[PDB]
Design a binder for these strands. Structure first.
Lengths: 436, 430
RNA sequence: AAA
RNA sequence: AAA
């Protein structure tokens, strides 16, 4: 009945952290980066990471190191689970009792499950670090605390970061009601010296057309002694100061060389510089393309679930005139099932354009514009897909004006546009040709 | 010469009366019925009918009888026109001058066209007797007099009758808002001893759910004393008192035996009691009266349709097919009637002849008359039910899928319509 | 004048 | 972390 008891402990072993096998190397790197450049909860996660890679002994060393720095119950729960897997269950029962004693003394309603806001935050931070699939739960953890202690600085920050990252998933949807602006303001108010939270508020203000006010918080963060640099670089890049951003990123890269986020941002800077020259040399343009591919390729190498970086890679190979590699990466993208499923719209859309312009294959452009549209969630890319589809369909009707398929697709377009009368008119016109 | 002068008179010859050829015998009969049981206008109209029969000499008699009883101008005008066709130019000019002086005396703006409400009414009574193709003009003639004399009793009745008959054409159209109730009420008030108007108000009240108040006018119109029996028989027929309605019709038929309206109402009574081995005696009677009304007025589309439907009751599919085919070749004045023609022929093909294909053809044709009505809805539902039968035996039929999407469009369910249109276009991709 |  |  030890297993039955261990499953009631609140710790990383029972939090159902969604960690894909391919995300394991990157996760470990991101944890270690946090050890140095950002303290108990972080070593607990590192111990769990070490466990999942078959290094229980080295995991205990991270748990024992975590105990040196009520929040101890998570560390005791990981110990219990650890000794269980190692066959040393006699020691596991000890830490089970240490948890029960604290639960007993605090009038906790459960034998081993400690109900308190400290553990709620512990669960939120772990989830917030192990991938976007957990962000809804992570927000719930911090929101649970703020429901009773609305001015709590820790949960106020965790809630704002979670809400901010969830707004990023929906940044391109048409609804686009960003609910993280005020939570961030409150997070900055209750953590006045936390630059990480200040930069996020600035980026969210930049998202809302308030770039000016956002930059004020950017400078305040740069006044305190990689996380500020990596996110500040994004603010400057999107503002236009691409050279300033590249500088901040290369500095941050010295501290955290394995950061896929930095490599991705770095590539986006070179891409921005490639456009600068284009709108204006050839050795410089080819130089930046070769550098952008290098970093996009480095991000996809370290975190192959980085679907978006994989897409910027395939698109950059097009800029380089390397169609065999663009096709190669697009074929990988087409096999994915992104966490943010809306991303698949952009995959199909940009592959549709690739077919339309590089391959001059309107048949396949139509196929992939439809697949992007088949993800019904309204977005900017879905509108572009409907318009591009409308263009090719109209190009096929100016040749063969009685094409059954083109009359159906056009009537389908009008349906998506909300014009139902013209949709029925073309569907009916097509069904008459079908009568043969 | 004198022609351009004749075309300016206001009389039957210049009122563009729309009288189909097949309707001439029934018109002459209804004119004579009015002469005897309902008076200068009817003889003028009677004179015009004779001229159309090729009996110009017979017409001069009815015009001479008319003057024996400013409305004289209509008669004088018909005289002018009658003598022109007969070659008596000098005699026509004599009546042209008689009209010119009256116009001249009354400070009339035109030389021969007399403007006045009396002749506006005379024109209305003529239009109102020569078929429903003229009732819109009739209503206008009477609405012109009320425009400046809102209490004129004559025009108040002519406008109420025209408005009532027009409301009859649109009686089955959806959301039809009758504009004939208050015009009838006013007509009743300004003509208290005219039972004709009273019964019409009762029937219109019966049409508007106020049958109780309507029956009051029925008995009141019957107190003072054939035309009152026609429309009273309808009131009691539609109320359920079929026995009393049959009595009134039989009495009225003795006075005006050639009335197609009476034969039609009789056949409906026999049909009503039928619903409640002896039916053959009843079905044979209803067929005899529908057949009689159609014989006397071939353009009686509605009666011709009740005839075809009764041969179905009699089990004579041969005569039903024959009568329906004559109906299908018609172009009724009330085009909405064509919805019922196709609908009932569609049911005949569906049930009696066991041909859903032709049932579809005709349900569609009834629907293609876009005017919303009761029959159009039944045609959509019949088409729907019928197409669903096709889809239960065979789920992937292109036409059946297209028709079911077309049905949902008519019903206003645009989502289901787009659906079945789409999953049908997928089959079309082969 | 069916409805 | 593209948009």
């Amino acid at each position: 009945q030890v297993k039955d008891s261990l499953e009631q402990l609140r710790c990383h072993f029972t939090w159902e952290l969604s960690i894909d096998d391919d995300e394991m190397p990157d996760l470990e790197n991101r944890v270690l980066d946090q050890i140095e450049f950002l303290s108990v909860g972080i070593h607990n996660l590192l111990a769990y990471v070490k466990h999942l890679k078959g290094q229980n002994e080295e995991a205990l060393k991270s748990l024992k190191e975590a105990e040196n720095l009520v929040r101890s119950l998570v560390t005791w729960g990981n110990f219990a689970w650890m000794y269980y897997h190692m066959g040393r269950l006699a020691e596991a029962q000890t830490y089970l009792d240490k948890v029960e004693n604290i639960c007993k003394k605090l009038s906790n309603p459960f034998r081993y499950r400690m109900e308190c806001p400290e553990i709620d935050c512990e669960e939120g931070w772990a989830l917030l670090k192990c991938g976007g699939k957990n962000y809804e739960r992570a927000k719930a953890c911090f929101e649970k605390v703020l429901e009773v202690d609305p001015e709590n600085p820790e949960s106020s920050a965790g809630y704002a970061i979670s809400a901010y990252r969830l707004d990023g998933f929906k940044l391109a949807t048409k609804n686009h009601k960003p609910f993280s602006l005020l939570p961030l303001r409150q997070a900055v108010r209750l953590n006045p010296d936390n630059g990480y939270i200040k930069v996020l508020l600035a980026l969210k203000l930049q998202d809302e057309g308030q770039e000016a006010e956002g930059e004020k918080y950017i400078e305040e963060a740069l006044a305190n002694m990689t996380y500020v640099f990596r996110y500040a670089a994004k603010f400057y890049r999107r503002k236009g100061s691409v050279d300033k951003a590249l500088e901040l990123l290369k500095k941050a890269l010295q501290e955290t060389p394995t950061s896929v986020l930095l490599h991705h941002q770095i590539g986006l800077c070179y891409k921005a510089q490639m456009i600068q020259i284009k709108e204006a040399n050839r050795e410089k343009l080819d130089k930046m393309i070769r550098s952008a591919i290098f970093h996009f390729e480095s991000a996809v190498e370290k975190k192959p679930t980085f679907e978006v970086a994989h897409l910027d890679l395939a698109r950059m190979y097009i800029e380089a005139g390397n169609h065999r590699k663009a096709e190669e990466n697009f074929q990988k993208l087409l096999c994915m099932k992104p966490v943010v499923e809306e991303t698949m719209q952009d995959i199909h859309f940009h592959y549709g354009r690739f077919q339309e312009f590089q391959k001059k294959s309107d048949v396949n452009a139509i196929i992939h514009y439809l697949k992007a549209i088949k993800i019904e969630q309204a977005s900017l890319t879905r509108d572009k897909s409907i318009n591009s589809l409308k263009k090719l369909v109209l190009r096929k009707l100016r040749r063969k004006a009685l094409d059954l398929e083109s009359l159906s697709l056009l009537g389908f377009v009008y349906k998506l546009e909300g014009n139902m009368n013209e949709a029925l008119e073309y569907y009916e016109r097509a069904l008459r040709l079908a009568a043969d």
